[PDB]
Curated annotation (Swiss-Prot):
Domain named BetaCoV S1-NTD: residues: 1-268
Protein name according to UniProt: Spike protein S1
Function: Attaches the virion to the cell membrane by interacting with host receptor, initiating the infection.
Glycan-bearing residues: 6, 16, 45, 101, 119, 158, 175, 179, 238
Disulphide connectivity of cysteines: 7-143, 138-170, 150-229
Domain of life of the native organism: Viruses
Organism encoding this protein: Human coronavirus HKU1 (isolate N1) (HCoV-HKU1)
Amino acid sequence: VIGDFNCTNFAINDLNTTVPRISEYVVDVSYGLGTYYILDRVYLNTTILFTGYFPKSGANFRDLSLKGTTYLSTLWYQKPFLSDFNNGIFSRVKNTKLYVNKTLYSEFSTIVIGSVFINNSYTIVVQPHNGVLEITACQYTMCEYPHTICKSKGSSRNESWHFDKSEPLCLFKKNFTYNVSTDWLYFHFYQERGTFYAYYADSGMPTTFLFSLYLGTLLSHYYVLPLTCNAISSNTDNETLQYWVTPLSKRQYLLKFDNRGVITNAVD
Ligand SMILES: *[C@@H]1O[C@H](CO)[C@@H](O[C@@H]2O[C@H](CO)[C@@H](O[C@@H]3O[C@H](CO[C@H]4O[C@H](CO)[C@@H](O)[C@H](O)[C@@H]4O)[C@@H](O)[C@H](O[C@H]4O[C@H](CO)[C@@H](O)[C@H](O)[C@@H]4O)[C@@H]3O)[C@H](O)[C@H]2NC(C)=O)[C@H](O)[C@H]1NC(C)=O
Ligand SMILES: *[C@@H]1O[C@H](CO)[C@@H](O[C@@H]2O[C@H](CO)[C@@H](O)[C@H](O)[C@H]2NC(C)=O)[C@H](O)[C@H]1NC(C)=O
Ligand SMILES: *[C@@H]1O[C@H](CO)[C@@H](O)[C@H](O)[C@H]1NC(C)=O
Ligand SMILES: *[C@@H]1O[C@H](CO)[C@@H](O)[C@H](O)[C@H]1NC(C)=O
Ligand SMILES: *[C@@H]1O[C@H](CO)[C@@H](O)[C@H](O)[C@H]1NC(C)=O
Ligand SMILES: *[C@@H]1O[C@H](CO)[C@@H](O)[C@H](O)[C@H]1NC(C)=O
Ligand SMILES: *[C@@H]1O[C@H](CO)[C@@H](O)[C@H](O)[C@H]1NC(C)=O
């Protein structure tokens, strides 16, 4: 389970089925994937040795996106999908582009980052709403079996990942736009000395600082929410979710900057 609130009994498989194969992809940083811009600094036409929260080059990304239709499997809400956060994670996220009457809609998996996922603890939630990225850190009563839905194409079940009837206590609540036409988003989520840090990119690969948030507590877990949809399948549109995640750690990189100060290359 994620949280411990019984939000629903509708269409749950508690059967000990085959675990879905988590797909894996090698981390290659040679074009600046997994890197970020340093503070308020510009570096031009140069190489820098810098120690930062970076992926291990040659480690694996895991695709933790889960697309459902009606049934939720209880095995989705366990290890290996429920994952240790440690220092942090780098996300490579497919922007799943869907069309309704030729109008573009942007979907991708919500991620939750927390400890115990109960309403005496803060859970960070990063959720897309079609070009708006809603980021919150609140005392959510997370569901046992949380998921999101396609708002665009609809779903056979309602969205429920928390059950707060009155507004929960929040440390953070901000919206960030992202470019809905992009094919990929990139995120760093990490923690240092009781403070959470987020970086993102929607164009190119090297991320930029979004925000930081003092928590005063260690985050221990993250989970990529299942998304349920009538579409995003071989019998509808041949679209897919992808939410690739790999651990961060304090690593020395060589960073190469071009004459615009873009990180064009990196070495672990
Ligand atoms: C912070 O987050 C916590 C979870 O970590 C929330 O606490 C849970 O809140 C729910 C909702 O109030 C509690 O569930 C309800 O418990 C009642 C009491 O349970 C006893 O009695 C029943 C028989 O009635 C026994 O079966 C059971 O074993 C216990 O002995 C139940 O009466 C409720 O059931 C009724 O309402 C539901 C509504 O969906 C109906 O489906 C049922 O048919 C029935 O009519 C219900 O089960 C839960 O027990 C709490 N857990 C804990 C650990 O406390 C907090 O509410 C939340 N707080 C805030 C401010 O967000
Ligand atoms: C951040 O973006 C979300 C999603 O657009 C906003 O939430 C919606 O706000 C309207 C107006 O209050 C409600 O009618 C909707 O029900 C809300 N939810 C959704 C999923 O659309 C939110 O208001 C924005 N602003 C802030 C500060 O969070
Ligand atoms: C969850 O709540 C529903 C509604 O009361 C109930 O039918 C179901 O048995 C509950 N499941 C568990 C595991 O408690
Ligand atoms: C960038 O650096 C190279 C190597 O020193 C140099 O040859 C080139 O002229 C520089 N270009 C600019 C635009 O500074
Ligand atoms: C979805 O929510 C509506 C409104 O509360 C309700 O009528 C409907 O039965 C719900 N469906 C499911 C599958 O939860
Ligand atoms: C959005 O992304 C597309 C595809 O990468 C790009 O062509 C376009 O210029 C971007 N638009 C904005 C406003 O950045
Ligand atoms: C999805 O792709 C396969 C292979 O090209 C094709 O057989 C199938 O008809 C496609 N489905 C849709 C809904 O386009």
